[PDB]
């Protein structure tokens, strides 16, 4: 809750975070950001060598605790392949600690934005999205920011959902949700003409990623986000570039992440089963882009 006390948001952290000093366990500190949500480190785990990254955040600079409180609690429960594992957090007065593992492949945003995938790439990368979609989906979690930027890769292209900020956790009590929370680009027009989401919006923002694959941007990037909402809601399903250029299987796996009709729209779980998927390269295909981003970036 957005009322509750400063100093209960700091005794419940107490509770869920492990006692004493994380220095007293990691080493490589290298800052590599900073910002509203707080700074991040790569580092060593001391003890197993394992490469970590570590967000430090001062809670008296932290606007919405709630939430940050909320993103553990998620992670520590929802642990999944495809999901960047939480490994622990740490509390030194108003000092919160959380270590991740560390992926040193980087975001999809650098591939997107510098290499052009193919189509058997990018139906390895829906395929692993939608495994921890489907997983989160049956667990009740809806991502809400899904994009390019909140998927972290692996040096041997594991594929794994980041930055949980945002999630919703629903019930069949309360299984929709209205908060327009994400990404303005990735939002399904369903956010902005409606009061009332579930998990599918997802899926959108899922076949949104899609087309960053294929063209490098969401839709209407150069738009101002005001003027994209009212595009997305007004245009419904975005329109590729050039369609001509992709497979009918990979068209046909689009159309079904970005239906306007939210009941007609694929669940995670329906589009596992989808032919694109069948087409997917071995994730080890992902490794000379991911290079070659990085080179680049
Ligand atoms: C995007 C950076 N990043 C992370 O932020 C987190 C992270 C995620 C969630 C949380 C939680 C906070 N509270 C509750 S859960 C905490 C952390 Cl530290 C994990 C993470 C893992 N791998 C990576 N890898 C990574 C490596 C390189 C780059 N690059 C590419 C090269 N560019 C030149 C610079 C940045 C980006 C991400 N970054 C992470
Ligand atoms: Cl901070
Ligand atoms: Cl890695």
């Not at 052009?116 to 692993?128: F, K, L, N, T």
């Not at 069948?278 to 990085?294: D, H, Q």
């Amino acid at each position: 809750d957005p009322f509750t006390s400063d100093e209960e948001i700091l005794e419940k952290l107490r509770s869920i975070v492990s006692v004493g000093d994380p220095k007293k366990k990691y080493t490589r500190f290298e800052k590599i950001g900073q910002g509203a949500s707080g700074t991040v480190y790569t580092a060593m785990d001391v003890a197993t060598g394992q490469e970590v990254a570590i967000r430090q955040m001062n809670l008296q600079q932290q606007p919405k605790k709630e939430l940050i409180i909320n993103e553990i609690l998620v992670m520590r429960e929802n642990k999944n392949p495809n999901i960047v594992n939480y490994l622990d957090s740490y509390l030194v007065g108003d000092e919160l600690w959380v270590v991740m593992e560390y992926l040193a492949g980087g975001s999809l945003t650098d591939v997107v934005t510098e290499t052009c995938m193919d189509e058997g790439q990018i139906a390895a990368v829906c395929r692993e999205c939608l495994q921890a979609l489907e997983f989160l989906h049956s667990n009740q979690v809806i991502h809400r920011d899904i994009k390019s930027d909140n998927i972290l890769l692996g040096m041997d292209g594991s594929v794994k959902l980041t930055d949980f900020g945002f999630c919703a956790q629903i019930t069949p009590e309360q299984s929709k949700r209205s908060t327009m929370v994400g990404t303005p680009y990735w939002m399904a027009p369903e956010v902005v003409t409606r009061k009332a989401y579930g998990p599918k919006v997802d899926i959108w923002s899922l076949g949104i990623m899609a087309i960053e694959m294929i063209e490098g941007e969401p839709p209407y990037l150069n738009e101002n986000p005001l003027r994209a909402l009212y595009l997305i809601a007004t245009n419904g399903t975005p329109e590729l570039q050039n369609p001509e250029k992709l497979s009918a299987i990979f068209r046909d796996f689009l159309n079904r992440c970005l239906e306007m009709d939210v009941e007609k729209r694929g669940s995670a779980k329906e589009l596992l089963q989808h032919q694109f998927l069948k087409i997917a390269k071995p994730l080890s295909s992902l490794t000379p882009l991911i290079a070659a981003a990085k080179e680049a970036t």
